[PDB]
Write a protein that binds this ligand. Structure first.
Ligand SMILES: Nc1ncnc2c1ncn2[C@@H]1O[C@H](COP(=O)(O)OP(=O)(O)O)[C@@H](O)[C@H]1O
Ligand code: BEF
Ligand SMILES: [Mg+2]
Lengths: 1623, 178
DNA sequence: GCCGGGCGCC
DNA sequence: GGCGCCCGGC
């Protein structure tokens, strides 16, 4: 991959709008800098237009737009459809409707793209319906990139593709084609269809013809397409909306005359003067209306010229507004809005008729569920903004009073309570637009009636948006009425003062005992079938209690507003109505009355006006609250029922004497006018506390012992219910007291003993679950602090500020409690971190929410001087840190029993909670705190480190220019430090929380972050590895689109140079083809091939940045020369540097090359060939010689070592610092525990490098041991790698896995592959070697022998049943029996003589049967493979005629010495003395094997060489051969393939034949293709019918995805967005 | 007695007059999905009263996911209106509630084996098959799924009053068990 | 120059 | 479960 491919991939997958925007911007810049890359970009981005996901499709369209805008415009002078012929009737009568097309027809998808285009182009004329009959697909049998490219318009090929894709059956592809044409035409249309050589006059004709041809297809799609979305209240037709936009796009450039043809065709589609009278009208009319919308929108210049066009578009609009279909009405209403100010100039008659019909479309009620009225009222609001329309209203009034404006406006009132929320919102917005007009127009309808209607629409509305709009409308109405005269407002609202005051103060109740509002108070809109009646009944269970509280507080706001304007002598009715409510028996009535007084005092001009309420308010906080509330009577009745149940339990099972116990009162306190004898919770306390034990005294022995085990539980039930009642009453007391205190604070009274005010407000902040009340209280305390500080009464102010600071730290989930975590050291707290647990967590969340809002409002209120006006907050957030971290930690800071640790933690939490809202003038204070926080980050205690990490995450998140320079200068360079673990742990925690909080804002700084994060994925501490890998996985994704980001504006000069220093490193790491050439300094004695030079550049790249990798080049490409030249160059460079500087880290040290034993000679030979000036020491031989060599190793450049010698002599090999440590044939250390691997991993070395032929056999999970050697812990410790990757992947392979497990496995393996890929270097043989002749891999078949058949049937008939039944077991021993049987079977398959040793099951019968044959066991007639090998030897001329050209020289491979000896004896000596052969297996010492291979390779006298696969199989160059025969085979295909490939490699100059000797039957069948061509590169019920526990949710097993967001339609089809893109 | 349960799902049924050419509903409307080889009906969805409506070829409709009776009626009327818009002769002929599913979180955990073993005639326990006890009432014909965590969800009620009745009738029973 | 052995692995 | 091979011995 390259940067471009990843950047283009970002468009599909991306975090946010911002990342995709950056990707498209950087694609545009990449095109600008390299203009010729235009089509290489478009061929990459265009295929995303067909993508399944809307957002990907839209982003690909935007990417094309931006890319095209940077391309040069086309002007060479610097079969088409004709638009006139379009007969609308035929295209709808005939032709193919375009829908969400059927399943894929794969026979057509298989076509070459150009012939696919040709076939679809043939079918296009049929599908349009020009044939005069409905085209059927059967008539057309089905049976350098298409988007790729000065003689013609460059995008001609792309547009030819998209114009035919525009009719594809799939809806996604039609959307994609429409958007692609939209962008391409929008930018480059003026050059469309031009061609070189022709004159400008003729090129104008060609351009006109081409754009007519395009608009023909766009109209065809407009009328043919019927796909629609009915999710929302108004149906959306996405494809023909997009095609409307594309028609607008072509309309910009198309000649003025052709606009009239387009207009005539759209007008015909809308009027439908000749089409069939059917339901087909709907789609065609809607298409015509969107077309007319874009025609009028983008070509205003045409409408002004002549009257016929404007007359016809308004004719279409007028017809559509009267249409039966609601969607036609909606789009018609929308059609005229863009052109209103253009239309008002038109002849009076058209304007009068339009006003008449748009008003009359509201006179009749539409269908209950028709949402189209909203659009019509938007049209009406826009029309009534222009004075000409109002003058037309005056003209209409002058001849018919019934159509006057002030008497027409009431037609909007019945729609206020409309069933569809969009209609209610549209009505409120339209009425607001009417209010903001000249007072003479509106003074007739602004009256009591509309005020009452809006106020009752402020109470009963549940939807938030309708609520807020209703309250804004109320504000404008009441303010505008007041502006004329306050007496006028008083007179209008006089008659409704009392009913709406009652509705404002109404109680709320409890879920199953609602308190319904009197329906008589609600006035009908008309002046007097889904009803919004749940809210009127006060049904707290169907409408959540928070909604009712919100309605009450909003009604309080409105009533407080209107009370302000009425002159105070006239407020007497309102005053008495609220004062009678402050003492109401309901808690909610008192709360609502307090809020009404609060709002009246608040938005009144001066508190002295509102002061008259002060004593009624103050008495609420001063005096003892009532012991009962009628709202809470349910709780006390439940208490009474439970206590009566306890008494009954005493009477029945305690068997107490009846009549010596209290008869509880029938009526409960708080019931309406209940007398003083009513039951009360105090009596419940008396029962459960005193009477209970009294009855226990009264109960006789023999009853107590059996009665108590029920009476105890009954008592606990009663006492918990009593506590619940008390808690509810206390909550109401707190709420009412808080509301009263807020009302007092609004009136600017400051009592000389403010503790009751402060206590009430704090109790509300600390407790109020309902968000609205808590926010009100928070704003109250925030204002109260300002009042105290301005008055100079600083004492209470500092007390409340300290209490707020205390509250802000209460959420333990965010602010740790120091005394628990104080001892924790060297634990990354970000990883590690009864019902009372959840209850306390919830209460902590509530109180922190309240205090955090209070401090936010404090910051916003005080502005730039908060730290000056409120010193105690400065003390809080500055004194603990300067004490603790100016010098070293005072020893008291570690003590859990000293509060100072919690003071430090609270200081950090206060900084974190204040600084994202702190005014920008106070950021120098936070930056003055940063030096102390970054020192606390290096602190030893885990909790300080964790809090400091979060604090710096937030500080950098809100101070990017200044925080990030401090972080990069004074934190990150310490992260490499090995001496002290706290530094690295702190730094990685900062990066973790920083990546978490900043999200996409880190984009300028990911280069600073990535390299010191990549450096720590191999850290020794486990938690550092976990967090580093987690961060890197989500931080590398942003690297591809970093390079184009402009520099961070404020960043220091040195840091930019540091960025540039390693931007190149990361860019090379991700895409190795960018790696710089490395000029090998030393005089290597052989010239490198091209790919070898590039691989050496890669190895030198790794050596330069201290990474370590796997040179996984395919077998025989010449890895030895690459390795030798890099090793020699490294030795040369470090010797030069040590002479130059004396630095110990570059001092001369020996390198080590570990290889299998047989290659010890090979490596020395290769070194002596290519780099004779390096001394090489062969640390191989008998132990005495190695002991003699024991100390000499330091004094040589390269040490060669066998794996087994490394294992046995690790005690001396481990003692030396080894510089480079090359594992030749590194796949032998795949086992994680095998002894040679446990030995090799102990070696210290500066650079490590594995060489392999094949890295894995079956699965990528085999890589773990290799990377645990190269980079300790890079993929984690074994358990961490297994549970992170291996277990998910393995589990996902089976059909047992659920789809979640399957996709988890796919994600996990992709994560591993992306993590490991940059370090492997893999280049296949055939890609880079062209001189090397091919190889062929034949089979050769020989029939089984008699004895083999006999012994097979015997083994299966005697032991086969037991083995096959053992296959039903899964334990180690069972599959061990299977493996043993298979291994036994193969030995039999080769020859019977291998297995038929004395004492075998078949021995004696075998002896007598051999006597029956009259021959010995060893007769080769019983061993077929020997009988086959002679055939291949002879026909290749080996041993024939014992010219001497000798066309073939062979290798023959065996897995085991017995088979090799059998072959060497029987075939090579008994049958064919003519053959000359050489020996290579374990019988010859490792030092002789190199010599014997050299003898075979140089001397053509010998004909064949015999190999044991274990010995000769790996790496040992034997190029001289040209055929290989495998008489015996391994299970593992990779060893088999490598045994072939060590014959076919560089320097070999003959076509190679590989023969496998195969017996016809048996296990040979299971090994035929392995090596041939595999390179290994709750509430749940059934809805349809009620039953418990469904096992399968049939109709929803897909999950239905999820319902798409409407913002896709709202933001994409916005006409104001479309016109913005013109220029 | 006790603390009232919430509702979570109301399933309502409507009979449309006309036979539906069901595949064309999937072809024309985006908010619809049809896979005859998996399930036999087209699962429409609508956003505002968030619901899914299984529309069968026989004209039957089953609307799910509303949380109020009037909300379910409104949603079903909107679905009938949508099917009328596609061109079929569909009428809102009939409407019945068929299942109101309640749910509540009781504070204390349940000694579930006690309920499984004391009550016989209306209690059943299946520990690994489904972790909750199945309680089958007789008078209100409500099935209660009782979990060890204190979760109770009630089903089979025709109207919410039966849900409240069943909860306040089972609460003084399982109150005897932790 | 030969031998058989115990450790190691599939 | 086998068989391989770096060993110590004659
Ligand atoms: N520059 C080179 N020029 C000529 N031959 C080369 C060159 N590099 C490698 N070779 C040849 O290719 C073979 C080396 O392959 P090798 O490094 O041994 O792969 P492996 O070690 O994996 O078996 C040798 O025949 C060698 O002569
Ligand atoms: F060196 Be390779 F694995 F043949
Ligand atoms: Mg090699």
């Amino acid at each position: 991959a390259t940067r471009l491919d990843r950047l283009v991939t970002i468009l599909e997958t991306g975090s946010t709008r911002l990342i995709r925007d950056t990707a498209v911007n950087q694609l545009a810049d990449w095109q600008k800098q390299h203009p010729e890359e235009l089509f290489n970009l478009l061929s990459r981005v265009v295929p995303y237009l067909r993508h399944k996901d809307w957002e990907t499709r839209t982003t690909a369209a935007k990417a094309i737009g931006k890319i095209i805008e940077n391309a040069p415009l086309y002007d060479p002078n610097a079969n088409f459809f004709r638009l006139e012929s379009l007969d609308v009737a035929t295209i709808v009568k005939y032709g193919r409707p375009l829908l969400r097309g059927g399943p894929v027809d794969y026979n057509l998808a298989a076509l070459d793209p150009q012939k696919r285009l040709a076939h679809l182009k043939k079918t296009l004329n049929g599908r349009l319906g020009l044939l005069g009959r409905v085209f059927e697909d059967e008539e057309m049998p089905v049976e350098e990139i298409e988007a790729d490219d000065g003689a013609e318009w460059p995008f001609e090929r792309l547009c030819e593709f998209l114009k035919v894709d525009l009719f594809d059956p799939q809806w996604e592809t039609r959307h994609g084609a429409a958007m692609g044409l939209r962008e391409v035409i929008r930018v480059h249309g003026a050059g469309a269809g031009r061609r070189r050589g022709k004159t400008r006059k003729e090129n104008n004709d060609l351009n006109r013809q081409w754009l007519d041809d395009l608009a023909y297809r766009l109209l065809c799609v407009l009328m043919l397409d019927k796909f629609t979305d009915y999710s929302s209240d108004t149906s959306v037709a996405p494809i023909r909306e997009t095609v409307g936009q594309t028609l607008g796009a072509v309309l910009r450039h198309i000649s003025v005359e052709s606009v009239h043809a387009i207009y005539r065709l759209l007008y015909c589609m809308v009027t439908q003067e000749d089409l069939p009278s059917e339901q087909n009208m709907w789609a065609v009319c809607h298409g015509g209306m969107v077309g007319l919308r874009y025609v009028v929108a983008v070509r205003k210049d045409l409408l002004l010229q002549d009257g016929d066009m404007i007359d016809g578009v308004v004719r279409c609009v007028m017809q559509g507004l009267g249409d039966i279909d609601d969607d036609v009405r909606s789009v018609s209403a929308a059609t005229l809005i863009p052109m209103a100010k253009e239309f008002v100039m038109m002849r009076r008659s058209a304007l009068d008729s339009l006003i008449n019909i748009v008003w009359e479309s509201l006179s009749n009620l539409g269908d209950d569920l028709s949402a189209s009225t909203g659009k019509i009222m938007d049209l009406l609001a826009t029309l009534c903004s222009f004075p000409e329309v109002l003058e037309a209203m005056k003209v209409s009034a002058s001849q018919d009073e019934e159509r006057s404006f002030t008497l027409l406006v009431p037609r909007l009132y019945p729609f206020l309570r409309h069933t569809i929320t969009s209609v209610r919102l549209a009505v409120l917005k339209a009425l607001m637009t009417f209010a903001n007009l000249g007072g003479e127009t509106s003074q007739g309808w602004l009256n009591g009636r509309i005020l009452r209607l809006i106020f009752q629409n402020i109470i009963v509305e549940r939807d938030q948006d309708t609520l807020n709009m209703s309250l804004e409308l109320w504000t404008t109405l009441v303010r505008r009425l007041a502006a004329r005269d306050p007496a006028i407002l008083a007179d209008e609202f006089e008659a409704h003062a009392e009913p709406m005051m009652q509705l404002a103060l109404h109680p709320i109740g409890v879920p199953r005992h609602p308190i319904p509002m009197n329906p008589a108070l609600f006035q009908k809109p008309s002046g007097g079938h889904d009803v919004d009646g749940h809210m009127i009944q006060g049904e707290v269970d169907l409408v959540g209690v928070d909604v009712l509280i919100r309605s009450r507080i909003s009604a309080a706001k409105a009533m407080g507003l209107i009370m302000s304007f009425i002159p105070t002598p006239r407020l007497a009715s309102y005053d008495t109505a609220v004062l009678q409510a402050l003492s109401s028996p309901y808690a909610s009535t008192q709360l609502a009355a307090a809020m009404v007084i609060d709002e009246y005092a608040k938005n009144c001009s001066t508190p002295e006006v509102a002061s008259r309420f002060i004593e009624p308010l103050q008495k609420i906080i001063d005096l003892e609250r009532p012991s009962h509330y009628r709202d809470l009577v349910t709780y006390v009745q439940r208490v009474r029922s439970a206590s009566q149940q306890l008494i009954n339990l005493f009477r029945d099972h305690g068997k107490v004497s009846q009549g010596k116990l209290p008869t509880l009162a029938v009526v409960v306190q708080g019931e309406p006018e209940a007398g003083p004898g009513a039951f009360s919770i105090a009596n419940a306390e008396k029962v459960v506390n005193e009477d209970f034990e009294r009855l226990k005294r009264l109960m006789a022995p023999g009853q107590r012992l059996i009665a108590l085990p029920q009476l105890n539980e009954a008592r606990e039930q009663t006492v918990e219910v009593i506590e619940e009642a008390k808690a509810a009453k206390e909550a109401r007391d707190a709420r009412i007291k808080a509301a009263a205190a807020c009302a007092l604070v609004a009136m600017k009274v400051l009592p000389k003993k403010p503790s009751p005010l402060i206590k009430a407000i704090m109790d509300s902040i600390k407790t109020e679950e309902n968000q609205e009340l808590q926010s009100r209280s928070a704003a109250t305390i925030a204002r109260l602090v300002q009042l105290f500080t301005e008055s100079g009464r600083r004492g209470p102010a500092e007390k409340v500020v300290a209490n707020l600071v205390k509250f802000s730290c209460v959420e333990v989930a965010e602010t740790p409690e120091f005394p628990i975590h104080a001892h924790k050291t060297n634990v990354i707290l970000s990883m590690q971190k009864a019902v009372k647990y959840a209850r306390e967590a919830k209460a902590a969340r509530i109180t922190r929410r309240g205090a955090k809002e209070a401090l936010e409002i404090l910051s916003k209120n005080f502005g730039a001087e908060l730290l000056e006006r409120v010193p105690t907050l400065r003390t809080f957030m500055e004194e603990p840190l300067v004490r603790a971290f100016s010098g070293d930690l005072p020893p008291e800071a570690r003590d859990p029993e000293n509060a100072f640790g919690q003071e430090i933690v609270d200081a950090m939490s206060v900084i974190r909670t204040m600084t994202p809202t702190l005014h920008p003038a106070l950021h120098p204070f936070v930056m003055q705190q940063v030096p102390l926080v970054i020192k606390a980050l290096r602190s030893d205690l885990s909790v300080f480190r964790y809090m400091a990490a979060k604090c710096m995450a937030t500080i950098c998140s809100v101070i990017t220019v200044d925080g990030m320079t401090a972080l990069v200068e004074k934190v990150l360079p310490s992260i490499n430090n090995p001496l002290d673990l706290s530094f690295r742990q702190g730094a990685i925690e900062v990066i973790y929380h920083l990546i978490a909080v900043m999200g996409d804002a880190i984009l300028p700084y990911v280069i600073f972050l990535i390299v010191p994060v990549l450096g720590r994925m191999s850290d020794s501490d486990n938690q550092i590895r976990l967090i580093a890998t987690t961060s890197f996985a989500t931080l590398v994704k942003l690297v591809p689109l970093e390079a184009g980001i402009p520099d961070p504006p404020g960043l220091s000069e040195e840091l930019l140079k540091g960025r540039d220093r390693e931007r190149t490193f990361i860019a090379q790491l991700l895409d190795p083809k960018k790696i710089e050439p490395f000029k090998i300094p030393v005089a290597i004695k052989a010239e490198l091939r091209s790919y070898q030079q590039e691989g050496v550049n890669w190895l030198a790249f790794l050596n330069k940045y201290h990474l370590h990798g796997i040179l996984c080049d395919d077998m025989g490409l010449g890895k030895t020369l690459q390795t030798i030249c890099i090793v020699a160059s490294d030795h040369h460079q470090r010797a030069e540097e040590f002479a130059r500087t004396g630095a110990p880290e570059v001092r001369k040290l020996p390198s080590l090359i570990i290889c299998p034993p047989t290659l010890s000679g090979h490596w020395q030979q290769e070194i002596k060939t290519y780099a004779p000036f390096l001394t090489v020491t062969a640390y191989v031989g008998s132990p005495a010689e190695r002991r003699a060599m024991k100390d000499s190793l330091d004094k040589t450049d390269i040490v060669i070592t066998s794996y087994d010698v490394c294992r046995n002599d690790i005690d001396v090999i481990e003692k030396y610092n080894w510089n480079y440590c090359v594992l030749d044939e590194g796949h032998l250390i795949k086992n994680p525990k095998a002894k040679i691997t446990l030995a090799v991993k102990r070696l210290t070395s500066n650079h490590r490098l594995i060489l392999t032929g094949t890295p894995i056999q079956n699965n990528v999970l085999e890589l773990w041991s290799l990377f645990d050697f190269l980079m300790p812990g890079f993929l984690g410790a074994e358990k961490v790698f297994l549970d992170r990757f291996a277990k998910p992947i393995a589990n996902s392979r089976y059909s047992k896995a659920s789809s979640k497990e399957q996709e988890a496995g796919a994600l996990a393996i992709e994560a591993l592959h992306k993590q490991v890929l940059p370090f492997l270097l893999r280049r296949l043989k055939e890609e880079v070697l062209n001189d090397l002749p091919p190889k062929i891999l034949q089979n050769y078949y020989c029939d089984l022998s008699d004895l083999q058949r006999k012994l097979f049937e015997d083994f299966t008939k005697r032991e086969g049943k037991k083995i096959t039944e053992t296959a039903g077991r899964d334990d180690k021993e069972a599959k061990q029996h299977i493996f043993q049987a298979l291994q036994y079977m193969r030995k039999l398959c080769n020859s019977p003589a291998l297995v038929m040793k004395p004492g075998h099951k078949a021995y004696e019968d075998t002896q007598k049967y051999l006597a029956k044959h009259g021959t010995t066991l060893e007769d080769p007639i019983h061993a077929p493979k020997l009988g086959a090998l002679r055939d291949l030897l002879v026909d290749c001329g080996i041993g024939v005629e014992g010219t001497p050209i000798k066309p073939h020289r062979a290798l023959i491979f065996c897995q085991m010495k017995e088979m090799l000896d059998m072959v060497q004896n029987t075939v090579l000596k008994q049958m064919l003395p003519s053959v000359s052969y050489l020996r290579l297996d374990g019988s010859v010492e490792a030092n002789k094997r190199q010599d014997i291979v050299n003898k075979f390779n140089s001397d053509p006298s010998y004909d064949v060489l015999l190999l044991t696969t274990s010995v000769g199989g790996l790496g040992l160059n034997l190029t001289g051969a040209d055929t290989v025969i495998f008489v015996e085979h391994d299970w593992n295909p990779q060893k088999d393939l490598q045994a072939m490939d060590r014959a076919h490699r560089i320097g070999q100059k003959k076509v190679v034949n590989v023969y496998r000797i195969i017996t016809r039957g048996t296990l040979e069948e299971k090994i035929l293709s392995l090596q041939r061509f595999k390179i290994d590169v709750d509430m749940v019920d059934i809805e349809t019918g009620d039953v418990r526990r469904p096992g399968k949710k049939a109709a929803w097993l897909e999950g239905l995805g999820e319902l798409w967001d409407n913002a896709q339609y709202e933001e994409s089809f916005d006409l104001d967005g479309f016109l913005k893109t013109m220029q | 007695s006790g603390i009232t349960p919430t509702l979570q799902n109301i399933v309502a049924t409507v009979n449309l007059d006309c036979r539906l050419d069901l595949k064309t509903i999937a072809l024309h409307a985006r908010n619809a999905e049809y896979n005859p080889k998996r399930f036999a009906a087209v699962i429409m969805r609508i956003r505002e009263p968030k619901t899914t409506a299984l529309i069968f070829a026989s004209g039957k409709m089953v609307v799910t996911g509303a949380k109020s009776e009037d909300d379910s009626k409104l949603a079903s009327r909107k679905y009938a209106r949508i099917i009328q818009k596609l061109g079929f002769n569909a009428k809102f002929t009939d409407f019945k509630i068929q299942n109101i599913v309640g749910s509540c979180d009781i504070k204390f955990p349940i000694r579930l084996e006690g309920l499984a073993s004391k009550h016989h005639n209306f209690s059943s326990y299946e520990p690994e098959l489904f972790p909750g006890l199945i309680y089958r009432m007789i008078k209100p014909k409500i099935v209660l799924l009782i979990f060890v965590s204190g979760k109770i969800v009630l089903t089979g009620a025709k109207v919410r009053e039966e849900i409240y009745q069943a909860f306040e009738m089972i609460y003084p029973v399982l109150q005897d068990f932790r």
